[PDB]
Nucleic acid binder design. Structure first.
Lengths: 300, 514, 183
DNA sequence: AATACTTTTATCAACGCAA
RNA sequence: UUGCGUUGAUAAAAGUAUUGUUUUUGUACUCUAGAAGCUACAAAGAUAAGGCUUCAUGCCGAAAUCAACACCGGUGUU
């Protein structure tokens, strides 16, 4: 086990920034609510197929108040659950036709689809139009790289995270870059102090070295991403020898053990820690660096 | 003195190097890269062409705004009511007077949904049923009838009639929309005199205007590398003209067309040679005298030598029958043209008429290649029209392909073919980076994306190892392209090196020992 | 902008530059320190970020022009993004460098609209200091009633006992000849 | 963000005629 | 290893059409001319965030290329 590995680095900058699917949100009270919250909506596309009935009864056996018709047209929902008592929607279609709504007469519109409160809002991009009333978002926003900062007045590391959608074609010359003020906002949100020293930046499959300060241990990782964007400095790592981290396998003293799933989501924003970056040759000759340059690369 | 070994996989190469007189490991390593997925280029291409479609729809609406503002009908476009029924005004303006703002509404709605034009198989049956309906009305009348009868207008939707059920669809040809717009514009011209005939020609150009599949994107001052207006300042005529292949031995010359005099006389010569007087006799007989065929050619070789056709060795067979022999089919078919014959014409003019007629597949490309490439040609319009109908008449014969040779090598070789019975590879036998290794061969010879990636990353490993340590004599690869590549580089660099074709590192170490 | 310890050093530097006795400054209306509290502020005692907003804005409004506070914000953006600047020089020296870069751009691009004058500064007792600083403005950017939108503020550190000349041409020649002595 | 059409150029295989 | 005649698989690039998602508005459905914005239908706008000049059959944006640094296709080190 004196074998050396050699990986390939992924540092391309203009990739898929998000989905192209335009989602809708509402503000409502669902579940264990003490206030309103924003909910990404969903839709059952058609209920008379085999999939739409299964999705309907899944939502119905989870929670009945998720449906928007349950809150905005209740008696029609009563005439929706009278069929599900005695049989289903396909049988009603092949006997009586389309499931119309409640009305005085038989002249209400037909019911083919149903919206509900799908989930809570996570990472998004606010693309709300001018004359709109609720929020309109784009989901599935991917991460690109990390910038690692370090301050001396606390003696610990802080970690940034840039996405693909944090860059822009600019307004005078059409170059692809991020400004310095938006970068100051991203530095402020991630908790980096203004007077920290920029150490290096990490792409995917970039070899990381973690050393300790009290008990002289050494661990080597591969960087993946900048997961869990609610509390700070958490980094997802991968092994150097294999492709996975299955089990509650121990790594070093101060980090801990991998979770039950197999994912290594650690917090490197702590004291008693030390980080180097490894730049291998194509034959595997590991060269260790401590300072990359003077400033992070922002113009491409 | 040292032996190199490589184990090549899909996304990994394991590599090792030994000494073989002692048998200790000098180096071992594992190089890991992601796989060459072709699903990402399909995703990127699909999105680019969808973005072009969205762009050109919006530009049609912008061009309609510019045309309507330049001719002075409407001043501003902010007070236009978006809550009027466009099909009602489109069917009303066929006989009545549209009030100058509902005309803009009708024309904008008509340019938003034009039709298909590939027609001039359930989907084919539904669009033919819809054409069978539109032979008596315009499509605006059909859409208004569907609207005020069934409530629905758009998509594909099925309706149960009194005794039958039929699925409807919103697909009409472009000719019907053009006829309806021409009728509406002539009636409003009879009413409102600000819509001159140049307005009608400009609007119909916006409506039925499409690009050609051999043009591409771009404009005269727009300079695309995906279209005919190349970014180097020039202008191609057909973008599939710089994609035609090279010659087999001189890799800087364009190929020849299969349907000319030169390739066809070369093919009949190659099937005849496996002497000179009866070569020329059979060739002028098949060239000038008609009602020809392969069985007729074997009857004629029974005729002139006056024997039964025996001692046959040089013949190709098909699965069905036999007597596959080359003929002057294209030459004899180019003789039934009512304009002047091709016998007493040049070989350069014949071959470039064959080029122009083989590559271009429809009227405007054929026409402007005949007008633009034949310098000072001064061709008439009658022969252009009959060559258009001639190319339309033979698509299976004339769009055959392109001959694998070039006109330079074949003009080097057509006289020589006759005097001796000799074959092509023996005839060509008889006529005959400064330290690092190239990326020429490994970027050209691509069988798959996966093989291309893995072999080029392995060759980077190879040349890094030969830079670091020194010379070699044995290189092992776990095919023949990389073999003769390395063998010719090492003979040209005067080095006798024999190249022969955790886990992968160990396996490369093992085969380096083997 | 951002209020931190670097703004405290910049405030104390420019106070030592324009006022010659410190009690001309810390007793101004709107600022209004006391002697023990001024010694608390000066000698590192009080944190500047939890003070009143109106007092710190009054100090910055007295010591700086309106365009100069914008240049403080832009130099703060550029300064905290580089380790050379952050680990070599303090913030007031880099603010001086930024200010003279803007002055040189003014002199290069449009030389024939640069005007200047003698600046006058009111003390705490109502009496002014005549000739406290040198005003440099662009004449095209005038608002009216003697106000200019783009205006900077310098101080000469020459060792010769000759004053700045008057007139547009003479003062422009003095500014172009003494570009290392003003600060 | 998916389903219908049209077209061009090129390369591998394998089935034969020859070397 | 090289040429010709058949038919399978693939790759790269081009031109079109109809929906889908989503926002406003109108009409219907519902509750008392107002309200709720569910459920349908129809117009108009957007369709990876964005950006350019030449003013238009306008154009670009989801792939591959890869260890860094210094001195004459080569040359030295952590």
């Amino acid at each position: 086990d004196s074998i050396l590995f050699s990986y390939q680095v992924d540092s391309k900058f203009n990739r898929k920034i998000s989905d192209a699917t335009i989602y809708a949100t509402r503000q409502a009270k669902v579940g264990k609510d003490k206030a309103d919250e924003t909910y990404v909506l969903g839709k059952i596309k058609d209920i008379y197929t085999q999939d739409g009935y299964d999705a309907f009864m899944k939502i119905y056996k989870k929670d009945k108040s998720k449906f928007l018709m349950y809150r905005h047209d209740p008696q029609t929902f009563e005439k929706v659950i009278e069929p599900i008592l005695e049989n289903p929607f396909l049988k009603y279609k092949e006997e009586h036709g389309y499931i119309r709504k409640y009305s005085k007469k038989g002249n209400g519109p037909e019911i083919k689809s149903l919206k509900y409160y799908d989930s809570k809002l996570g990472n998004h991009i606010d693309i709300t139009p001018k004359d709109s009333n609720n929020k309109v978002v784009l989901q599935s926003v991917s991460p690109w790289r990390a910038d690692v900062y370090f301050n001396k007045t606390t003696g610990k590391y802080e970690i940034l995270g840039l996405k693909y959608a944090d860059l822009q074609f600019e307004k005078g010359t059409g170059t692809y870059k991020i400004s310095q003020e938006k970068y100051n906002d991203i530095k402020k949100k991630e908790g980096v102090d203004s007077d920290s020293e920029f150490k290096f930046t990490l792409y995917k499959n970039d070899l990381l070295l973690v050393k300790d300060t009290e008990t002289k241990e050494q661990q080597l990782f591969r960087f993946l991403s900048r997961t869990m964007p609610k509390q700070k400095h958490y980094v997802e790592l991968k092994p150097y020898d294999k492709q996975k981290f299955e089990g509650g396998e121990a790594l070093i003293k101060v980090l801990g053990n991998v979770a039950n799933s197999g994912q290594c989501k650690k917090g490197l924003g702590k004291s008693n820690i030390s980080i180097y970056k490894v730049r291998t040759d194509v034959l595997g000759n590991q060269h260790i660096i401590k300072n990359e340059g003077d400033k992070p690369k922002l113009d491409f | 003195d040292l032996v190199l070994g490589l184990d090549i996989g899909i996304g990994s190469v394991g590599v090792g190097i030994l000494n073989k007189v002692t048998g200790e490991i000098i180096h071992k390593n594992s190089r890991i890269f992601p796989a060459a997925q072709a699903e990402n280029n399909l995703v990127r291409r699909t999105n680019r062409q969808g973005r072009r479609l969205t762009r050109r729809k919006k530009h049609r609406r912008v061009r309609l705004n510019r045309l309507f503002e330049e001719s002075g009908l409407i001043t501003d476009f902010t007070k236009i009511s978006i809550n009027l029924n466009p099909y009602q005004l489109r069917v009303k303006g066929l006989t009545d007077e549209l009030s100058n703002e509902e005309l803009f509404i009708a024309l904008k709605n008509m340019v938003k949904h034009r039709g298909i034009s590939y027609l001039d198989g359930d989907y084919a049956q539904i669009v033919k049923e819809n054409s069978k309906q539109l032979e008596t009305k315009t499509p605006g009348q059909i859409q208004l009838e569907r609207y005020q009868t069934y409530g629905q207008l758009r998509g594909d939707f099925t309706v149960e009639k009194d005794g039958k059920k039929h699925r409807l669809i919103n697909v009409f040809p472009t000719s019907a929309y053009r006829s309806e717009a021409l009728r509406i514009l002539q009636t409003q011209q009879e009413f409102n005199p600000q819509i001159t005939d140049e307005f009608i020609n400009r609007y119909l150009e916006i409506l039925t205007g499409k690009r050609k599949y051999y043009h591409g994107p771009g404009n005269e001052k727009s300079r695309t590398d995906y279209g005919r207006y190349r970014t180097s300042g020039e202008t191609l005529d057909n973008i599939f003209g710089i994609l035609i292949g090279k010659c087999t031995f001189y890799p800087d010359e364009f190929r020849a067309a299969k349907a000319s005099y030169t390739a066809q006389e070369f093919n009949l010569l190659n099937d005849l040679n496996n002497s000179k007087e009866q070569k020329n006799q059979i060739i002028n007989y098949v060239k000038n005298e008609k009602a020809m065929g392969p069985a007729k050619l074997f009857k004629y070789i029974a005729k002139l030598l006056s024997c039964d056709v025996a001692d046959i060795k040089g013949y190709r067979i098909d699965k069905s029958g036999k007597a596959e022999i080359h003929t002057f089919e294209a030459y004899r078919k180019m003789k039934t043209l009512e304009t002047l014959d091709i016998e007493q014409m040049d070989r350069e003019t014949l071959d470039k008429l064959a080029y122009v007629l083989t590559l271009n597949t429809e009227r405007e490309g054929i026409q402007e290649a005949l007008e633009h490439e034949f310098a000072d040609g001064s061709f008439s319009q009658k022969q252009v029209d009959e060559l258009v109908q001639f190319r339309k008449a033979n698509s299976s014969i004339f769009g055959k392909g392109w001959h694998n040779f070039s006109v330079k090598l074949m003009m080097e070789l057509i006289p020589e073919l006759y005097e001796t019975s000799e074959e092509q590879m023996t005839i060509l036998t008889r006529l005959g980076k400064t330290k690092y290794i190239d990326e020429k061969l490994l970027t050209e010879e691509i069988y798959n994306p996966v093989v291309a990636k893995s072999v080029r990353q392995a060759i980077k490993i190879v040349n890094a190892a030969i830079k670091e340590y020194g010379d070699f004599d044995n290189i092992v690869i776990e095919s023949r392209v990389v073999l003769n590549a390395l063998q010719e580089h090492f003979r040209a660099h005067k080095i006798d090196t024999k190249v022969s074709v955790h886990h992968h590192a160990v396996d490369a170490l093992i085969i380096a020992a083997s | 902008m951002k209020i931190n310890d670097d703004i405290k050093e910049l405030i104390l530097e420019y106070m030592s530059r324009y006022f010659k006795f410190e009690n001309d400054f810390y007793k101004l209306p709107g600022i209004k320190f006391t002697d023990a509290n001024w010694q608390k502020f000066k000698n590192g005692g009080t944190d500047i970020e939890k003070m009143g907003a109106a007092r710190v804005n009054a100090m910055l409004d007295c010591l700086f022009d309106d365009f100069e506070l914008a240049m403080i914000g832009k130099a703060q953006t550029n300064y905290y993004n580089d380790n050379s600047l952050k680990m070599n020089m303090p913030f007031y020296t880099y603010y001086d460098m930024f200010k003279k870069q803007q002055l040189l751009k003014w002199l290069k691009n449009n030389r024939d609209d640069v005007i200047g004058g003698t600046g006058r500064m009111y003390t705490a007792s109502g009496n002014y200091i005549a000739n406290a600083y040198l005003e440099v403005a662009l004449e095209s950017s005038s608002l009216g009633s003697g106000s200019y939108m783009l205006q900077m503020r310098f101080k000469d550190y020459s060792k010769g006992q000759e004053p700045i000349p008057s007139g547009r041409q003479n003062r422009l020649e003095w500014i172009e000849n003494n570009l290392e002595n003003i600060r």
